[PDB]
Design a protein around this ligand. Structure first.
Ligand code: NI
Ligand code: NI
Ligand code: NI
Ligand code: NI
Ligand code: NI
Ligand code: NI
Ligand code: NI
Ligand code: NI
Ligand code: NI
Ligand code: NI
Lengths: 512, 511
């Protein structure tokens, strides 16, 4: 492929016969463009075909040189041209300072994700439904498991598996049972995963890839493989996927429920991922409720947690930002649904409230939905169709947060529990769940690390009804007092008449 | 001193004339009792007197050997006997697992401290008043600055300073201005501090010693000394005080307001303390509101923070425990007082509520009070007399938490926001601030990492009115249902009639 865009993939392939196990063959290349130089591993893709993938990050005239344990694939050379990324290619998502994210091209990224753990393991018609739902919804990230999920309500047998089957046996309790050849991957499994990740990429969705998880417990045994096998898998999947710009590594979902693995195993596996990632994708690890790994380790780019506690209030979310000084994502806080399980029974309003709280506190929050309806797929695990109401409100919320000039944070942390800022003279004030008809115009004088709020400034107010998905301009222009006991009021003690409803947020901005 | 208790001090002293600066003289000793061996630094104490202090941690027949750059203090040997600690000597406070504390003898320690930043820098009658107040109150820790404090409402000139004065000059604006000889400590300043720390020890109070702070800003300059001086001071004060069992090191109060120091300076200064502490006292650092240092560094034993956010609810406190897996102390959350400043204007109720929230969530919380009244000393900075009401409630709260069989934690973290546990079948349920007359008997089935709450168990309820400082036995005995949607109820759907008041806690225990 002679011409590729910055942050797309350049791919080499070789047809080669091997005497032994082709998955043991060493293959790599070094890519050079002036001062830019990168060495990456290749992989075997079945049918006597080896591949090396590269994601160039600079435009120019590139060259490469291969290295292999097979002479015919060793010392192979060629060239290609890399052109600037096109308007909708922003590159990978990167950390931006201590709290936020940006695409590689400088474009702001706010993760507003959902959950579809085993959507790539369902029948084809369900997978197509899931893609349709992703196309309609406003989510720009999805938590998804590489390996299939065995769980309450999730019993569908996958059609593809990551390894070849060495043999099938009749088991302890009479039933059929596949024994894996852990030395041979099934390339079709990974090719399928790649097709889906690319489809997400075209929808603008980051694939938050869960590399390991506990949702197995002997059904297949992918949660209890040896560390030699775990490392071989990591090396293989990184060789295949590290060139895919929209991938994030999630080391685990509910790490502390994987009984075969110790904390030391997780540190080893994490280091292995990072060492085999030439491009430095985002990397974190998710735990049981209120379980916090050592996120301060340099391998991790951000915090990825299961805990509703930080989203019970915006201030609680804000504390986490100061503790970690890495971006914080509450990747699981409860899901909107009708399940008997306390993790899957939120009202759509509560789901929406938790996401709002985290956003306004300066963190990010992932959605999920799980409505059981006969034998229909349930989204959080299986994909299919979105049946709930909170997914509509997260789409509206994206429009709100993306319209602000900077990321959100508390204006006067720990002191004012309701006022967010997204810039100089740019506020979102949460009216809260205590229903009322009137809010006195009152702001902190402190505005995070922006300049203090000045006197004689004229502000307009917009009433944002988050549940109703509406923005209504208020006709009164407010005028700021001097600082008075850490606060700033309107000169005539005015306020805003609001609907007697929960989930009202006021957007207060300077009259231009 | 030929016979010493375990965790008391053995002290050597030598009379010696020195040609040069006596504060530059190298002096140390190695103490041995069988397999127990410790090497500690000595110090110059003025009047041609050098000292070496040691805190033995095991009973037996001890010996020592000194080392010095002065021949007469080098290779000196002797012996002493160490006996078991007496009934009220529990040793230093140590970390106990991920979340709690114990004295060295295994006795439980719950920090229920107060604040008196510059109490050792006041006139004598004020310092005696502060001692009397400490004796009456129930606090077992006090946050206190080594160096004097210059602040709004705190302008008293200290009588003693940590360094000799090289000269006094008429300054920019005409006034007198002391220039320090940073190469010579004033031993009297440190002797005074030691007297007070020992008095605290006899009261059962831990001296949480703030080594550096920003409350100076050029009045004296102790906040802007060179790192060479900072290190010399650290080495000196550790040599003097590391043997005092009731000391904790606080690297700073409001570290991030000390403009002359970078994060790298703080890491250096912290490593210097730890390298010069033969015994491993508690060590942390306090910041500005909602400022979190890298508490995960191994130098720190615990988290010491200024932030009311974690005590806004017990769940918020509980989250910090899981994050850090070191003990957590909200050492500053607002003070009860009448000041115009938002740090010093809590009601006594709110001060009490914050402390209760933290305790119930499994962390610890420090009190302060600051009532301005004419020119009278204001406790948070100057000591003197306690004028508020919350200090009475923290004393009652001690008796409650110490009566429980284990430390407190949430029974069903993040899911149940009101139920604390201190053991199997041992609950404190917070009724909250929303005033009501009745609580339906309802508990989680989960009980932290204890066994689940069983059916057919009989519970009594004690109504604890935290503000009124009363415990009242409720006459109904409740009996548990089976697990029903993660909860457990009373078999007859009963509950507890309670006072229509805030700050009611129910203590629920098996009959
Ligand atoms: Ni775009
Ligand atoms: Ni879960
Ligand atoms: Ni920050
Ligand atoms: Ni800007
Ligand atoms: Ni007017
Ligand atoms: Ni005692
Ligand atoms: Ni302060
Ligand atoms: Ni724990
Ligand atoms: Ni026990
Ligand atoms: Ni009965």
């Amino acid at each position: 492929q002679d011409k590729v865009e910055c942050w797309d993939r350049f791919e080499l392939s070789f047809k080669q016969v091997t005497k032994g196990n082709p998955f043991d063959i060493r293959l790599s290349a070094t890519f050079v463009c002036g001062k830019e130089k990168k060495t990456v591993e290749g992989f075997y893709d079945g049918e006597n075909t080896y591949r090396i993938r590269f994601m160039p990050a600079v435009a120019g005239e590139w060259r490469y040189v291969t290295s292999s344990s097979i002479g015919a694939m060793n010392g192979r050379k060629g060239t290609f041209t890399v052109i600037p990324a096109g308007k909708d290619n922003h590159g990978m998502v990167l950390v931006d300072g201590e709290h936020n994210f940006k695409y590689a091209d400088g474009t702001r990224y706010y993760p507003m994700g959902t959950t579809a753990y085993a959507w790539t393991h369902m029948k084809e018609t369900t997978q197509e439904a899931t893609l349709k739902s992703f196309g309609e919804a406003g989510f720009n990230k999805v938590r998804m498991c590489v390996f299939p999920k065995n769980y309450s309500l999730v019993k569908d047998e996958p059609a593809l598996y990551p390894f070849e089957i060495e043999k099938t046996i009749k088991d302890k309790e009479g039933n059929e049972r596949k024994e894996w050849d852990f030395d041979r991957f099934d390339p079709a499994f990974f090719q399928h995963l790649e097709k889906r990740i690319d489809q997400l990429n075209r929808l603008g969705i980051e694939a938050d890839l869960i590399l390991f998880h506990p949702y197995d417990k002997g059904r297949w045994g992918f949660d209890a493989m040896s560390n030699e096998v775990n490392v071989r898998y990591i090396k293989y999947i990184t060789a295949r996927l590290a060139s895919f710009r929209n991938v994030w590594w999630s080391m685990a979902n509910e790490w502390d429920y994987v009984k075969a693995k110790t904390v030391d195993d997780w540190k080893l596996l994490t280091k292995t991922v990072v060492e085999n990632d030439p491009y430095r994708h985002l990397c974190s690890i998710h735990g049981a409720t209120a379980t916090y790994f050592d996120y301060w380790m340099p391998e991790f780019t951000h915090v990825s947690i299961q805990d509703e506690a930080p989203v019970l209030s915006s201030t609680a979310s804000a504390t986490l930002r100061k503790i970690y000084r890495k971006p914080v994502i509450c990747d699981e806080v409860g899901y909107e649904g009708n399940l008997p399980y306390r993790w899957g029974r939120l009202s759509p309003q509560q789901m929406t409230c938790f996401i709002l709280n985290g956003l306004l506190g300066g963190i990010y929050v992932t959605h999920g939905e799980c409505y059981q309806q006969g034998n229909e797929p349930i989204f959080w695990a299986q994909g299919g169709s979105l049946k709930g109401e909170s997914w509509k409100r997260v789409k509206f919320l994206r429009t709100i947060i993306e319209a602000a000039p900077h990321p959100l944070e508390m204006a006067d942390i720990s002191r004012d529990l309701v006022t967010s800022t997204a810039g100089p003279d740019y506020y979102l004030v949460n009216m809260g769940k205590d229903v009322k008809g009137f809010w006195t115009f009152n702001l902190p004088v402190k505005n995070a690390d922006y300049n203090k709020l000045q006197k004689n400034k004229r502000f307009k107010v917009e009433i944002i009804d988050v549940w109703a998905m509406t923005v209504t301009e208020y006709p009164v222009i407010f005028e700021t007092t001097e600082e008075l006991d850490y606060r700033v009021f309107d000169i005539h003690h005015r306020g805003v008449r609001i609907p007697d409803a929960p989930y009202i947020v006021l957007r207060i901005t300077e009259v231009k």
